């Protein structure tokens, strides 16, 4: 394991509506995660921990907030972390189109490979072993691959490789007879019969190492009309007989690109005796903006199976199987269950409270005697007293933006900065 | 409207100048404070928030960890430690505040600045030194002394000052009493204080905080009083006696001494105050800084926590935490009961790779063990407390030095020393 | 004695407007990236003036992104503040531009609104000058202006080429006139002493021009670009006189010091050669308190084998043989071979060095290495980055041609000034 | 092959008056070098380019100046100064022992010891890699040498594994001859090995952490020097002391004459013997944002010009002109090292001085400087002639602002050399 030239100067990292309404009024890479983070911290941290310092973040539109976070957490710390926006304002586009739109600029860098990191996932990876496999196999394109169960199988592009890991057959989210014809022996990649039997597939993780020249050729010369890397470029590449290599990844990897997946993965960090995924790691930790928030205060909290973010201010309440984000105010008598509180971007001066109260408005936080269950409370929500978010009738889907929320997969998501009046029941 | 010219950044040099056993295995400025901080973070942060970036820290001896903290938490400025002793093998000490400054005057002189900001001692407080220094320049003072108004009862314990009508200081009295205390009464109204409080507190004590012009410093330490060991009681009253302009400047706000085990214990537990702590480390524009550690959100299995603060990255099982401060990286085991205590936390996390190695020897892991009961205690960094330990001090001993046993009792408070091992079943 | 409060860094957002008149220096690079004064780039001027004025949240508006521009900005500055590039078009394959200074700001006004600031400091155009925006912002606050406009005094001869302003007796602007002449001009005389000019100068310079330097309150900007003049394309000729016409408080602020536009080849050319100035540089990039910054490069001291150098300036890391260098500016990493004679020229230098393995192979293929070749004679020229000038090349323009578009041959003459294009190869023996 | 643990987290770099008066009023590590640098920049830049970020600098006393240079010119790493004197070293081993307690506080595998002052570029990683791959206790950089020069150094003898088995300080005759080794074993080609059959230590060592405490505290609690006492002692005690071939430019600059010659060595064509700039491993220094150098009428031959010089009509031959150097009308500079200045004097400043009869910073009008080192901020009056016609080799003229050593005149930093003076 020893890249040469090191990744620092020869690899350009490129990070690329199912999360509605967390993306209603913010850039998607900025969506808060794990109490003290944002989605963008996963790929940016993995790069930095893998000695990759040249990072472009492709996104739909610029955001002062996103920039502030990137600037304060990384940019001010040879490298760079720059945002490239697709349009000039916030009023769809494929993975291949996103990269093609800026190819002209990526080509301006003197690098050997492009490390393409698409989609939103929870995982820690040392991209150096990825880049190394790519260079040792003289690959044109290398795809990180994960052992998949027949279950989730058709939701990912699947592949078959030779004893070298060279991809010989790629089949996008196949089904029926082809979903069966792709099934391969997952022992050759180390796994054992037991689980080689439960996960009989090699699935693309949607991240790739692609040789500089190969990229230009593929996106502009060979497949100028392709929109997706997964379903068009990769397949295209293989049919042209290019060297498409597979790199077996064997750690935790969760898609959090949908409300329910996001929800589940966030609450998974509360698991014992070890979280599913650990943001902290002595060697490769996930970073974020340093904030100097004070230690969390708890007046009288019975907390079970939960994690508490930075600088929370909690009264007498009950918190169960939840994630409480930074700067969360939880008032007297609240009960928090199986929920993700994203917290707040600032504190209200208390004096501020006794003022909003006079006006009959509600302050940031979970109001008194609230009952929040199976929910996502986005940043700065103002939940009035006696609000009950329980969705008794187990409604699966409901678009209620006007009332401050949106239900997806039965999970109620209160919108950023929304006010849920006192007494409301959802 | 009111700005320093030249700005503080380039024209002011900051100079930062008992608590045993917290000081037994570390340099005093590195002592952990309020869950996520260290003592040295207070003056350094006040300086940085006040646009002062050239800072020296004078202490008995340095350490790689103090340096780490300082360099990592803070990095045309610098934060450099200057010591009295260069190696533990050749013990040496400063004789006082003026003595320490004098020993490195030759280095402070190499800096092109207009004034030295001297901050002596350990106190919990927030202050914006810019208005202080601006006052110094506007009054053409040689030395400006921050003055803390107090009542007659508190007054006998400090160095008091007597001012004229323009706030200029004309006399000092070190811990005065009786006839001498009375002669020191002053109309605190001259310095601001509302008439009301002015009558409540007709006294003003220096606080170990001063601004001294570069030239003035050399003259005082090298030529006028080459023998003085202390600023507050010798050098400054001495400059006043020589006709130099020593000006008073009113200090207002929280200010609490924490250089004693009991004052330190109380100030730390004070941040759990019900409405709001008397001192808030966090502040929108003048927060207290520390090192970014990227610790994970604290985890709680089944914790019942009352009137307490929890720091960064704690790992707590089922337990009871009442009126306590839980330091960063604290592990608290099944069944523990923590009361009225300060847990400093740990410097790292033991990986299960060590916990098993530790189990192969039936050894005790870092943190609070199962079914321990900890009361009115300070548990220093990385302590290994075994199962069923009860630190309750039922008899109520006030003093006991039991270092070989890992602790020390001062003012009735049990302080378990850093890295100490308190065997299972021990009862204190 | 006084200063902004809130301080500038948290309450002022700088908006630098950058991104054909400087063609071909702009043929293959973002305009803000055009090399300047041997060791700098145009963008360094406004960004430095901002940093030296305690303004740290800076946006750079330009036509298109560039790895070079970004690399220079990252290394030199990005180190709460930021320096970010906002582009008009997201490419070169899908050409897109900005219909003016107001249009550029309007396109990203929604982003600027996301910032919690009191005023926007607008810095437009390519001008060489040093200024402390702090006093400028204070006047804005102390006069409760909605817009404060930096005003440059000048005589009648110079006035017709600028947007002029008329002020009342207290310095409040009440009328504009874009490049007036004859009657419209005469009606623009004012008493500069009103703004601070001494009686002597004021008399010789009875006119004041806008300079593309404005302070605008946050709300005023929103109201102006979106509500009152949603269709205006230019600030100084449309939006600001507009604001005045509406009765907003548009206040003048005197500017006293060096200032040259460097937006045309001739002006850029003359301003660069002006730093070789005999008594003191008209403009000094270096200053005791407000230095012009650039990217640290760790270049080695320049080497001179046998150089007779008069009235010239030499940049970092040059490698020079036996030659004559006169009234010229020699950019970073410049290689000048034996016998070369350089007169009244601007050598932009090079982005890298070529060893000898490189030079050897080049000699073989019969190519030319980077730098000014042997026995060349360069006069009244701008030699862009990495040029390869062959042996015995003569850039003397004997016929005094003023204009000549000759890009296929590596150059472009404009105002009698020959500009060799970035990375161009001028074959040995060529006479221009 | 990458070190693992990598260098940044496992290796601690430790950098340790023959240059008088260049050291009369400045910390030694701060001595100006090659127009734009200072001595300390060589070892520090070599460490940085070798991925070594934890760096200590040992020196007699501290200075704000040196600290300022260190902070500004240079996560988890550091460059810190450890002073032997708290203000107004018996040897390499002494210096290290004095702060052994501090280094011990770091969790590192080895200590990279870089002693002395030399112009040289080395990639310490392969050196460390070797230390590790050979399970060495101490790895010593070896400089190949011929018989003529070897007798003036401390030599080492090795076994066929490259293991050092014996030291000899400046041996002669029979002992010298008994120190011949086969430099081929260390990797030298048969040709060069026969030309240079001897190997000297260079004051560059890699020492395992535990080994250092054991040697300095337990085994030789009273040694002063590593080269002559501790390391030969370590070998005598059977520890694994391994040699590692240093095969590159390496020049001593520890005496006025060698320092002078090395500095002027960078004017040499086609390329200097040593190059400060380098695509991959450049020497770093403080970023000063100084303006391009200005020349009114200068005839410059075989010379190098630093950053921000302000030069009038003059002749500069075979010289090195330091940053911010002001050179007045009619001056003639030859075979000299002008160290420049730490700031510029403006005309407002210049006039006031003249009004006072004082001399401004720089080479005055019609001066003739030859075979001289002009330290920082020197004020040379008009018409001064630093020629030394009687070729005096030594002379201590401090009170007069100068010093002559080896026939080289050295003007002290901030010294005033009144107009008309002839040295």
From Swiss-Prot, chain C:
One of its GO terms (molecular function) is glucose-1-phosphate adenylyltransferase activity. Activated by 3'phosphoglycerate, inhibited by orthophosphate. Allosteric regulation. GO terms for biological process: glycogen biosynthetic process; starch biosynthetic process. Belongs to the bacterial/plant glucose-1-phosphate adenylyltransferase family. The keyword Nucleotidyltransferase applies. This is Glucose-1-phosphate adenylyltransferase small subunit, chloroplastic/amyloplastic. It comes from the Eukaryota. This protein plays a role in synthesis of starch. It catalyzes the synthesis of the activated glycosyl donor, ADP-glucose from Glc-1-P and ATP. Heterotetramer. GO terms for cellular component: amyloplast; chloroplast. The chain holds residues 80 to 521 of 521 of the full protein. It comes from Solanum tuberosum. Residues 355-365 are annotated as: Allosteric regulation. Substrate binds at residue 179. Its EC number is 2.7.7.27. It is found in: Plastid, Chloroplast; Plastid, Amyloplast. Pathway: Glycan biosynthesis; starch biosynthesis. Keywords: Allosteric enzyme, Amyloplast, ATP-binding, Chloroplast, Nucleotide-binding, Nucleotidyltransferase, Plastid, Starch biosynthesis, Transferase, Transit peptide.
């Amino acid at each position: 394991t020893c890249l040469d030239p090191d990744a620092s100067r020869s690899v350009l990292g490129i990070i690329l509506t199912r999360l509605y309404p967390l993306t209603k009024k913010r850039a998607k890479p900025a969506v808060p995660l794990g109490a003290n983070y944002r989605l963008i911290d996963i790929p940016v941290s993995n790069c930095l921990n893998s000695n990759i310092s040249k990072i472009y973040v492709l996104t739909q539109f610029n955001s002062a907030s996103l920039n502030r976070h990137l600037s304060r957490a990384y940019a001010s710390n040879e490298g760079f972390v720059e945002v490239l926006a697709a349009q000039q304002s916030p009023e769809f586009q494929g993975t291949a189109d996103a990269v093609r739109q800026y190819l002209w600029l990526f080509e301006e860098h003197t690098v050997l490979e492009y490390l393409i990191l698409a989609g939103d996932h929870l995982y820690r990876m040392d991209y150096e072993k990825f880049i190394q496999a790519h260079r040792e196999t003289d690959a044109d394109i290398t795809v990180a691959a994960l052992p998949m169960d027949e279950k989730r199988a058709t939701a990912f592009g699947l592949m078959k490789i030779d004893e070298e890991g060279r991809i010989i057959e790629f089949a996008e989210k196949p089904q029926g007879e082809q979903l069966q014809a792709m099934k391969v022996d997952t022992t050759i990649l180390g796994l054992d019969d037991k689980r080689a039997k439960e996960m009989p597939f090699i699935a693309s993780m949607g991240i790739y190492v692609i040789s500089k020249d190969v990229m230009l050729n593929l996106l502009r010369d060979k497949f100028p009309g392709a929109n997706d890397f997964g379903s068009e470029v990769i397949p295209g590449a293989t049919s042209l007989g290019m060297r498409v290599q597979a790199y077996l990844y064997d750690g935790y990897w969760e898609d959090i690109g949908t409300i329910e997946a996001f929800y589940n993965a966030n609450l998974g960090i509360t698991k014992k005796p070890v979280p599913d995924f650990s943001f902290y790691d002595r060697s490769a930790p996930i970073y974020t903006q340093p904030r100097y928030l004070p230690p969390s205060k708890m007046l009288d909290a019975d907390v079970t199976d939960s994690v508490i973010g930075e600088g929370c201010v909690i009264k007498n309440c009950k918190i169960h199987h939840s994630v409480v984000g930074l700067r969360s105010c939880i008032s007297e008598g609240a009960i928090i269950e199986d929920s993700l509180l994203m917290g707040a971007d600032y504190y209200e001066t208390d004096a501020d409270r006794k003022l909003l109260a006079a006006k009959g408005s509600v302050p940031i936080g979970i109001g008194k005697n609230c009952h929040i269950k199976r929910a996502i409370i986005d940043k700065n929500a103002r939940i009035g007293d006696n609000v009950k978010i329980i969705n008794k009738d187990n409604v699966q889907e409901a678009a209620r933006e006007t009332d401050g929320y949106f239900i997806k997969s039965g999970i109620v998501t209160v919108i950023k900065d929304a006010l849920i009046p006192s007494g409301i029941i959802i």
